[PDB]
Ligand binder design. Structure first.
Ligand SMILES: NC(=O)C1=CN([C@@H]2O[C@H](COP(=O)(O)OP(=O)(O)OC[C@H]3O[C@@H](n4cnc5c(N)ncnc54)[C@H](OP(=O)(O)O)[C@@H]3O)[C@@H](O)[C@H]2O)C=CC1
Ligand SMILES: CCCCCCCCCCCC(=O)OC[C@H](COP(=O)(O)OCC[N+](C)(C)C)OC(=O)CCCCCCCCCCC
Ligand SMILES: CCCCCCCCCCCC(=O)OC[C@H](COP(=O)(O)OCC[N+](C)(C)C)OC(=O)CCCCCCCCCCC
Ligand SMILES: CCCCCCCCCCCC(=O)OC[C@H](COP(=O)(O)OCC[N+](C)(C)C)OC(=O)CCCCCCCCCCC
Ligand code: SF4
Ligand code: SF4
Ligand code: SF4
Ligand SMILES: [Zn+2]
Lengths: 175, 115, 124, 90, 139, 359, 111, 112, 160
């Protein structure tokens, strides 16, 4: 057949706004992403000492709730999975099952050295060397344990990424 | 404190014949729950193969002679049953148990690095 | 070229350029160890396909910097004492013998010490 | 002893003036502190801006240049030997 | 520190546009004496208000409006902001400044989620060097 | 899978590259290669990327859907799976997708068209531009994927563009380009086993008379592995399919019993017979009203065409692999949609086939 | 962060002490004689996903070449970015040299 | 001892079929004159003909698939090592340590 | 009190003993242990002595950095302490303290080397969780939540 395929169309994250229908779908993206960024409800998946710093983020001094962050005890009501602690072999299948039960859109944060890459227990017979061998991880928070501000920097970094999403402008342009 | 379901006391047997009665009894107990093993674990194979592979593992130890080896292999024999009944293992473990699978020529192993 | 960019030399040949991203360091072209991987070969990799090489870490090569220091010259003594110019925040105190007609560098700092009487020959 | 202490004797921020009298009239226990530390007292010279020049402490017998032979104070090598009493020695 | 009087006084001292920015990113209306600006452009203030609570006597005003990144605070001021030092890095004694023998450029924030994210690589050459083959012909 | 995807640890490409593998073939091992799976976020790409990264082969995955690519990384170790944002209307991105690669795979394709791309631009324009750029980037091997009835003379648009797509690849890359023509691939969350399980299938009698041959998606994924790692497959065309002949009308009914779904199937809308001139009309309307890919006009013509086997091409016996029959794999892919659990073996499924055709 | 002398030479003399203390074995050091004879390291990695942030390497360094800067806000999108090689650590030592001096001056006598 | 104790240890079959252990007593190091590390008997496993060590492509690490590379056992009698090796059914081979031959050394010998 | 350790014999403090063995008694005892801690903490603030904080034995404690960089023997000991370690005379021990959870103890076996031969850790929570079945027998689901909290089960210690 005939296909007049250009070569100079910029990729989606680079494409400037030209017509009105770009802004219409961009606005639907901002309003949708702003709500998801602001209602940042994680899932209480604290496993070990990394969870103690997770609770301190919700303490009065830092007060995660002031930013719209409410820890939820169920995957159905949660969209963020925070892996805070060591992922053992015995815990690994349960972590995958809990991850699969979260409705989209979902993001996973890896907190501390155990979740990231094993940490102190990297050469153990019962520890998974990085939770990214079981679930996809969207951002890695470093430390043992990461300070409460280090965890909030990880959450703030992810929100900046969620606000950069173009789920609906992608349909209008990339699709 | 009370023991959990399908538990048994741990006694070191001293007679060879006594053990085989326990060994044979335990075998049907594996066989009896085979359909439930499929149902509870949602196995993709009919219960016939589940009964099939249980029998093979018993024979693997058939020819032990010394008694102290006989008990420990029976003590651990019961434990694997008890965990299987009570749904303690996850579906991933049981699938991988029954999902397991001629050696290459000398040139072939040599060609790919061998061992 | 790829001739200087892939072999270590005591001193370079051409003047280094800070904008050239293929240099081993912004202030030195060739590597300064025999087993140091050249930076040109290091970045010729798939993981750099969609990166911005200007923003990768490029610390200034310390070999070129340390030879920009003047030689300390000791007066009427053949032994220099060096401690990193920080005392408790420097290296352990090491005594350097300057009998030989050359500048003996310090084991830790890399500062070069000599005798004043030997300066004229050294500066030739 | 651990008897109750007047509120103005605790290092926390406390009200002054008309609000102090309101605070005493309405609180259940008037000598309970708000818990917010005094800004002018708590950590005011931060740990990184102190004035004390630290000096390594050394007790004399074990830090002296004299009368300080190491074998006198080498306790790690004077550990009690392990002796087991069998029936025969009893 | 929560009464509307504390917000009224800070609102009047700053003026609208300065306070509107704090009403957009800070969520609180504060006013303080300016201490210095860092290489990225952030300005660091100190609060003299007698009612401000213990850990809230210093703060920042980031350069951007809709976004803030904590990695944008220059390292010198990152320590002062956290109540780690009493001397701001613009009041340093010349016998306490760091001596850098290399040019210092503009501060670079955390580059993750961009193309400037650091890429690790091996800095060592391979440990075996294969033979450079040559053919020689018999007499 | 197994324990080592190669037959040798040294593999020289058409371009003089000597690739030496290290390790036993597990996660920490490497093969020295570097593939580029296009459309790796697609149904077939995910299995193909998984197998390559499982054995330490670096895989560049060009993507456009930012979230859909995240789950690809779990398959590979650190630094193995790499992500390059791209668009087939952008050339620079594709010239970076294949820059460092040693194998190029092209799974991009469509049976539907959109407001920004037609079937002509995707099945023909994209594959051509990939092969042209993959050739100029010094890639030793290219593997291409097309439909099962690639025939440039077909009145259907899908097989019209898929057939021409084969030519423009070999006319761009050269006479070394391998070609794979898989049959309808069935797997978990497969587009084929989906519409067979969908309850309210409008126009069922029109759509399900089409006859095909089932084929395992994993075997297609494993077949693509053998093709890339073997240099004797260059320039060869593969027609991948199964042995036993199955018709969707047979499957849609054999499935019906496994799902266990009297009055309800008629009331629930499981059967929605339709006059064809209406289906051509409703599917016409949803092309410009629906924002999602609906069962369109071109797909309707395909329902009038049974699968054709181009007997001049090769099969699984060339690869020394036994094709897997849908009898043993139909059940485990309908358990998501499914006393004692009713388990169907190979014998149970074949007997269930007899009942459907018995009046 | 890996530090420098005021003269600019790297502080580390590739002594490999920090590698031997490190409880988690997060450090990989490869060294040899430099081009001009100095005892320098050409490869130096810290697996920041394996370090337990314990400060032993800092205590054991005889020349204060390896320290821990007060930075905590460096969370990364990918885990590859948490494998700090010698280029990365020396770039941190330059970035945070002023703040390292803040802490070293204050807590020098206590060590 | 005589029992096939390996059937209860749960160790992989490959330690019996595919690996070779070594019973040896560590030799005195040339650099140092201490003689204490050479008084306990040790067991170590042979390396693998391939996959013992290979360079990680990304960071240049030392990857390995040998799960016995960092396993060294200690004993105080030679027999206990051999008995333990026999109990596990290991395919071992013993390395007899060399014995230094006595030579009397006299200060006066420098002239006589 | 049974084996006073680390200046716990110098300060004066009381202990609280229950009588009903229920959750309310353990709640009261802990709230008393708060105020007894605040009673010790003040004394340690007033009785703090000057002097070294570690053993004046450079063969088990690293020398100060200033002395390390100026005195040869300090550099030797600093070197061998951070690479070889310090040797512990052979034997074994069982040291228990009054941890906040309960009695925590370690059974360390030494071999004359620089690495422990064995280290068993006796976590109070591990012994408590065994008694959970013996206590929860005859209680309701909202009552189980109380019993877990009254046991103080941090599962790092239980699953050491
Ligand atoms: N049972 C089956 O699936 C059968 C399929 N085939 C053919 O195999 C090929 C692979 O399809 P399959 O993986 O199975 O399922 P999909 O149809 O979901 O795969 C389509 C792939 O091509 C990409 N694609 C489509 N349009 C574009 C575009 N403008 N730009 C970039 N990428 C695009 C898609 O990217 P994205 O996902 O981001 O949209 C996707 O990865 C298809 O051509 C199909 O016709 C042949 C026989 C059986
Ligand atoms: C009721 C209101 C519902 C929406 C409220 C928030 C919308 C929003 O936040 O929309 C954000 C938008 C888009 O941002 P932009 O700067 O155009 O991005 C692109 C930058 N260009 C212009 C350089 C390309 O901004 C507006 O101008 C929205 C105007 C429409 C309202
Ligand atoms: C039925 C539903 C009812 C409406 C629901 C309400 C949804 C809440 C609104 C979301 C807001 C939001 O998201 O605002 C913040 C976002 C995200 O900003 P950013 O991510 O930094 O990028 C944006 C900034 N740039 C691109 C320059 C970096 O946009 C903005 O900054 C919008 C900036 C322009 C706003 C113009 C508004 C015009 C007036 C509108 C009212 C008279
Ligand atoms: C309320 C208005 C609904 C518009 C939806 C629409 O018009 O959607 C339909 C079309 C087709 O494009 P598509 O949906 O990507 O086709 C993919 C789906 N198929 C395979 C069924 C064809 O879209 C457009 O041309 C959108 C142009 C902008 C319209 C205004 C918004
Ligand atoms: S990373 Fe450190 S703090 Fe976090 S769970 Fe592991 S050991 Fe605990
Ligand atoms: S701080 Fe980290 S790198 Fe340093 S010794 Fe401790 S674990 Fe190792
Ligand atoms: S301890 Fe210091 S000098 Fe020694 S190797 Fe480590 S960083 Fe280098
Ligand atoms: Zn010096």
């Amino acid at each position: 057949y005939s296909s007049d395929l250009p070569t100079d169309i910029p990729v989606l994250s680079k494409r400037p706004h030209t017509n009105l229908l770009d802004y219409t779908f961009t606005t639907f993206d901002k309003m949708k992403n702003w709500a998801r960024k602001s209602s940042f409800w994680p899932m209480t998946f604290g496993l070990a000492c990394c969870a103690v710093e997770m609770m301190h983020v919700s303490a009065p001094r830092y007060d995660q709730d002031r930013l719209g962050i409410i820890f939820r005890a169920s995957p159905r009501q949660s969209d963020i999975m925070i892996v805070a602690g060591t992922v053992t072999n015995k815990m690994a299948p349960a972590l995958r099952q809990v991850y699969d039960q979260m409705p989209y859109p979902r993001w996973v944060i890896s907190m501390g050295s155990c979740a990231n890459g094993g940490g102190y227990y990297h050469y153990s017979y019962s520890v998974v060397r990085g939770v990214d061998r079981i679930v996809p991880v969207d951002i890695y928070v470093p430390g043992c344990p990461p300070t409460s501000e280090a965890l909030m920097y990880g959450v703030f970094q992810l929100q900046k990424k969620m606000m950069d999403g173009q789920t609906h402008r992608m349909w209008y342009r990339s699709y | 404190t009370n023991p959990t379901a399908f538990a048994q006391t741990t006694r070191y047997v001293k007679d060879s014949t006594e053990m085989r009665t326990l060994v044979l009894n335990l075998y049907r107990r594996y066989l009896r729950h085979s359909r439930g093993f499929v149902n509870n674990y949602n196995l993709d194979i009919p219960a016939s193969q589940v009964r099939t592979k249980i029998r093979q593992e018993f024979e693997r130890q058939r020819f032990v002679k010394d008694l102290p080896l006989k008990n420990v292999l029976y003590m651990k024999a019961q434990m694997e049953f008890q965990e299987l009944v009570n749904f303690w293992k996850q579906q991933c473990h049981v699938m991988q148990y029954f999902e397991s699978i001629k050696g290459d020529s000398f040139v072939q192993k040599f060609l790919k690095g061998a061992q | 070229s790829t001739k200087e960019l892939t072999t270590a030399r005591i001193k370079d040949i051409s003047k280094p350029d800070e904008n050239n991203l293929q240099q081993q360091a912004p202030n030195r072209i060739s590597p300064w160890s025999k087993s140091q991987k050249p930076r040109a070969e290091a970045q010729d990799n798939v993981r750099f396909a969609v990166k911005d090489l200007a923003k990768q870490p490029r610390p200034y090569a310390a070999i070129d910097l340390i030879y920009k220091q003047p030689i300390r010259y000791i007066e009427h003594d053949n032994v220099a004492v060096c401690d990193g110019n920080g005392g408790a925040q420097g290296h352990p105190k090491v005594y350097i013998n300057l009998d030989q007609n050359k500048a003996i560098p310090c084991g830790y700092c890399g500062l070069r010490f000599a005798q004043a009487a030997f300066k004229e020959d050294i500066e030739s | 002893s651990g008897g109750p202490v007047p509120v103005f004797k605790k290092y926390t921020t406390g009200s002054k003036g008309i609000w102090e009298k309101i605070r005493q009239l309405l609180t259940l226990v008037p000598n309970r502190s708000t818990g917010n530390p005094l800004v002018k007292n708590y950590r005011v010279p931060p740990p990184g801006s102190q004035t004390l020049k630290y000096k390594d402490p050394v007790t004399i017998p074990a830090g002296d240049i004299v009368k300080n032979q190491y074998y006198d104070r080498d306790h790690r090598r004077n550990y009690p030997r392990l002796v087991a009493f069998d029936q025969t020695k009893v | 520190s929560s009464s509307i009087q504390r917000t009224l006084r800070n609102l009047w001292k700053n003026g609208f546009k300065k306070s509107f920015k704090q009403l957009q990113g800070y969520n609180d209306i504060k006013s303080g004496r300016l201490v210095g600006t860092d290489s990225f452009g952030n300005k660091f203030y100190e609060v003299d208000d007698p009612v401000e609570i213990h850990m809230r006597t210093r703060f920042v005003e980031y350069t951007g409006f809709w976004r803030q990144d904590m990695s944008e605070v220059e390292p010198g001021w990152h320590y002062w902001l956290a109540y780690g030092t009493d001397v701001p890095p613009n009041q340093l004694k010349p016998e306490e400044k760091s001596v850098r023998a290399y040019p210092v450029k503009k501060h670079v924030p955390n580059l993750t989620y961009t193309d400037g994210a650091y890429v690790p690589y091996n800095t060592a050459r391979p440990k075996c060097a294969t033979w450079d083959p040559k053919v020689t012909e018999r007499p | 899978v197994s324990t080592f995807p190669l037959k040798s640890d040294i593999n020289i490409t058409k371009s003089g590259k000597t690739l030496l593998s290290v390790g036993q073939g597990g996660r920490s091992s490497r093969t020295g290669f570097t593939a580029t799976v296009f459309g790796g976020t697609g149904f077939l790409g995910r299995v193909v990327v998984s197998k390559l990264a499982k054995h330490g082969t670096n895989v560049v995955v060009p993507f456009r859907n930012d979230r859909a690519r995240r789950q690809l990384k779990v398959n590979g170790d650190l630094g193995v799976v790499n992500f390059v944002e791209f668009d087939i209307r952008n050339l620079k991105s594709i010239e970076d997708s294949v820059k460092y690669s040693d194998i190029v795979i092209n799974l991009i394709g469509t049976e539907h068209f959109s407001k920004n791309f037609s079937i002509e631009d995707v099945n023909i324009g994209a594959a051509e531009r990939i092969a042209k750029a993959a050739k100029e980037a010094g890639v030793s091997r290219l593997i291409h994927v097309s439909s099962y009835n690639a025939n440039p003379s077909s009145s259907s648009d899908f097989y019209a563009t898929k057939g021409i797509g084969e030519q423009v690849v070999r006319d761009n890359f050269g006479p070394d380009a391998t070609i794979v023509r898989p049959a309808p691939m069935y797997f978990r969350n497969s587009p084929f086993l989906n519409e067979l399980l969908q309850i309210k299938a409008l126009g069922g009698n029109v759509i399900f008379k089409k006859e095909v041959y089932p084929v395992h998606a994993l075997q297609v994924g494993e077949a693509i592995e053998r093709i890339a790692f073997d240099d004797a497959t260059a320039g060869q065309t593969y027609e991948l399919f199964g042995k036993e002949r199955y018709s969707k009308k047979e499957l849609r009914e054999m499935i019906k019993h496994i799902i266990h779904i009297g009055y309800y199937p008629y009331s629930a809308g499981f059967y929605l017979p339709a006059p064809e001139p209406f289906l051509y009309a409703f599917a016409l309307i949803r092309q410009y009203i629906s924002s999602q890919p609906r069962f369109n006009v071109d797909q309707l013509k395909r329902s009038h065409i049974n699968q054709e086997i181009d007997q001049s091409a090769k099969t699984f016996t060339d690869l020394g692999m036994v094709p897997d029959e849908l009898s043993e794999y139909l059940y485990r892919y309908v358990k998501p949609h499914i006393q004692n659990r009713t388990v169907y073996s190979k014998e149970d499924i074949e007997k269930l086939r007899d009942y459907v055709n018995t009046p | 962060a890996l530090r420098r002398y005021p003269s600019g030479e790297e502080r580390c003399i590739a002594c490999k002490l920090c590698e031997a203390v490190c409880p988690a074995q997060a450090i990989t050091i490869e060294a040899e004689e430099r081009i001009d004879g100095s005892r320098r390291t050409y490869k130096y990695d810290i697996d920041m996903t394996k370090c337990i942030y314990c400060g032993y390497c800092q205590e054991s360094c005889p020349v204060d070449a390896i320290v821990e800067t007060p930075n905590v806000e460096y969370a990364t999108e990918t885990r590859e970015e948490l494998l700090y090689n010698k280029e990365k650590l020396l770039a941190n030592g330059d970035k945070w040299e002023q703040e390292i001096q803040y802490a070293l001056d204050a807590d020098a006598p206590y060590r | 001892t005589d029992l096939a104790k390996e059937l209860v240890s749960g160790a992989p079959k490959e330690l019996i079929t595919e690996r070779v252990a070594r019973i040896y007593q560590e030799a005195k190091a040339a650099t140092q004159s201490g003689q204490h590390n050479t008084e306990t008997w040790k067991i170590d496993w042979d390396i693998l003909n391939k996959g013992n060590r290979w360079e990680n492509d990304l960071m240049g690490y030392q990857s390995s698939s040998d799960y016995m590379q960092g396993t060294i056992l200690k004993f105080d009698t030679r027999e206990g090592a051999i008995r333990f090796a026999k109990g596990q059914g290991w395919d071992y081979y013993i390395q007899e340590p060399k014995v230094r031959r006595f030579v009397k050394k006299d200060y006066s010998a420098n002239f006589y | 009190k049974s084996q006073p350790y680390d200046a716990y014999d110098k300060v004066d403090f009381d202990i609280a003993v229950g009588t009903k063995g229920d959750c309310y008694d353990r709640y009261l005892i802990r709230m008393t242990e708060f105020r007894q801690s605040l009673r010790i903490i003040e004394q340690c603030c007033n009785q703090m002595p000057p002097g070294p904080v570690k053993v004046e034995d450079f063969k088990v404690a690293p020398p100060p950095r200033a002395l390390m960089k100026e005195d040869m023997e300090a550099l030797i000991h600093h070197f061998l302490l951070y690479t070889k370690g310090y040797a512990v005379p052979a034997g074994e021990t069982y040291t228990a303290i009054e941890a906040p959870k309960g009695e925590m103890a370690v059974y360390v076996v030494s071999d004359g080397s620089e690495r422990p031969y064995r280290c068993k850790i006796r976590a109070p929570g591990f012994a408590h969780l065994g008694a959970f079945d013996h206590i929860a027998r005859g209680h309701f689901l909202p009552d189980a939540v109380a019993i877990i909290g009254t046991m103080d089960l941090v599962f790092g210690e239980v699953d050491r």
